[PDB]
Write a protein that binds this ligand. Structure first.
Ligand code: DJ6
Ligand code: CL
Ligand code: MN
Ligand code: ZN
Ligand code: ZN
Length: 453
């Protein structure tokens, strides 16, 4: 009646040995956690990174939030950490006429789902969300200022989240394209009821989130295999969130009761994440939640070799939906291949397999456009073009392997799936622009094969 909480998600407490290597561990729990979409990770007891900072010297600009179920929010007037905290604590304490630590988590959860479902209640809250900058930086230790020998052990940790993008079992590593939103950590300052709507990460990547201090964060999560069920359910009840958007800052997202999803047979899991705990989201796992009170978290995207085939499927899916890519997947594969001699050996074996599918798809597409009568061709270094200058006019995919142009419409490109969509000139006026000949590609792949023995 009213709110029936979803079953709890898996919890992991690894030993110092298991905990040593982030990617080994995440690869270990993967067959479990991928069935529930999210999971929680408790570090060893002696693992306490030193959060330290001035609550007075760090300023930020707050975002405002209305709390209404099925109402649309867009994915992406000054507070210090101290003045925000004073506001958040007063708010929660006045809402319940209790001292903040005495409000049971069970009750804030029930209350949250009641107030978003009621039209008479116009509750608004505020929060902070921004990538790490100089005006406001990471909660983890970084290099600059001299550091105490404890901050040193934590400085190179796998679980320091400034380090995780740029390690070498991460594939998003050697991307030289700037994808700052997706390589740098984000900082979140929460208060009671401030929330995050149902979403999946760009390019179906993993994410990892650490709560530094404060009151808990409540999460809901759906496993990757149920993603499309969840999307069907959400199209019936809020079809406005699915009207296609002019870009990627304008993706529409919403709050929705997990009981609604459970009624339509979507599996959902919950957890409360407390200070010093990690939550991990797996590829294409939908998730949402809200904060129990004043707190501070930090989070980052990342991609393992596991993910590479889903990254290809996802870019394919983006094309069907005509939505924008954050980076070119093919451009990343080729960049890694061009660094094949310094690649980790299991990485090189996995890239080579994805490159083989890439090449074979590209062969077929080029034969198809040839039989359409496109005859002229010229090499072109796509990676030098700004992204907005190389998106398919039809499906908006970011071009890298190849594209069709026409002197008729200078500057415009279509990918090889949308040759019919550039203009009305006969196909002999068109030109095939291409990064690599088939003959350049096979030696790139061979170098990968050698590296992997
Ligand atoms: O909170 C946010 N995102 C989030 C948080 C935790 C897990 N996944 C996603 C977020 C980012 C914005 Cl920009 S406005 C909000 Cl709200
Ligand atoms: Cl409301
Ligand atoms: Mn997220
Ligand atoms: Zn296209
Ligand atoms: Zn033309």
């Amino acid at each position: 009646s009213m709110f029936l909480p979803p079953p709890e998600c898996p919890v992991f407490e690894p030993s110092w040995e298991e905990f040593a290597d982030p990617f080994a561990f995440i690869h270990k729990i993967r067959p479990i956690a991928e069935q529930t979409g999210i999971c929680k990770v408790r570090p060893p007891p002696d693992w306490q990174p030193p959060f330290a900072c001035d609550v007075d010297k760090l300023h930020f600009t707050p975002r405002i939030q209305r709390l209404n179920e099925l109402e649309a929010q867009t994915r992406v007037r000054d507070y210090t950490l101290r003045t925000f905290g004073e506001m958040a604590d007063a708010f929660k304490s006045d809402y319940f006429n209790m001292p903040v630590h005495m409000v049971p988590t069970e009750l804030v959860e029930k209350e949250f789902w009641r107030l978003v479902s009621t039209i008479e209640e116009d509750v608004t809250v505020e929060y902070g969300a921004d990538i790490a900058s100089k005006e406001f930086g990471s909660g983890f230790p970084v290099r600059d200022i001299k550091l105490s020998p404890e901050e040193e052990e934590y400085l190179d940790s796998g679980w320091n989240l400034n380090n995780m993008p740029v390690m070498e079992q991460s594939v998003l590593a050697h991307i030289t394209a700037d994808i700052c939103g997706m390589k740098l950590p984000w900082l979140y300052v929460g208060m009671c009821f401030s929330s995050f709507c149902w979403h999946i990460e760009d390019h179906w990547s993993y994410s990892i989130n650490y709560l530094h201090w404060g009151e808990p964060k409540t999460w809901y999560g759906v496993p990757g295999y149920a993603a499309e069920q969840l999307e069907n359910v959400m199209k019936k009840l809020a079809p406005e969130l699915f009207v296609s958007q002019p870009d990627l800052l304008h993706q529409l997202v919403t709050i929705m009761n997990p009981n609604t999803l459970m009624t339509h047979e979507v599996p959902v899991y919950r957890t409360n994440q407390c200070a010093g705990e990690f939550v991990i989201t797996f590829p294409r796992a939908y998730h949402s939640g809200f904060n129990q009170g004043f707190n501070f978290a930090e989070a980052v995207n990342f991609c393992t070799v596991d993910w590479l085939p889903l990254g290809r499927q996802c870019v394919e899916h983006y094309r069907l939906l005509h939505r924008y890519c954050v980076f070119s997947h093919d451009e990343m594969i080729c960049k890694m291949a061009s660094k094949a001699d310094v690649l980790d050996v299991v990485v090189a074996s996995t890239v080579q397999k994805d490159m083989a599918i890439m090449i074979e798809d590209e062969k077929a597409l080029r034969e198809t456009v040839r039989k359409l009568g496109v005859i002229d061709s010229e090499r072109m270094d796509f990676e030098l073009l700004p992204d907005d200058e190389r998106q398919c006019v039809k499906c908006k995919t970011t071009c890298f392997m190849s594209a069709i142009s026409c002197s008729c419409k200078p500057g415009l490109l279509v990918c090889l799936h949308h040759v019919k969509e550039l203009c009305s000139c006969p196909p002999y006026k068109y030109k095939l622009r291409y990064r690599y000949t088939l003959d350049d590609l096979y030696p790139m792949m061979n170098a990968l094969k050698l590296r992997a023995e």
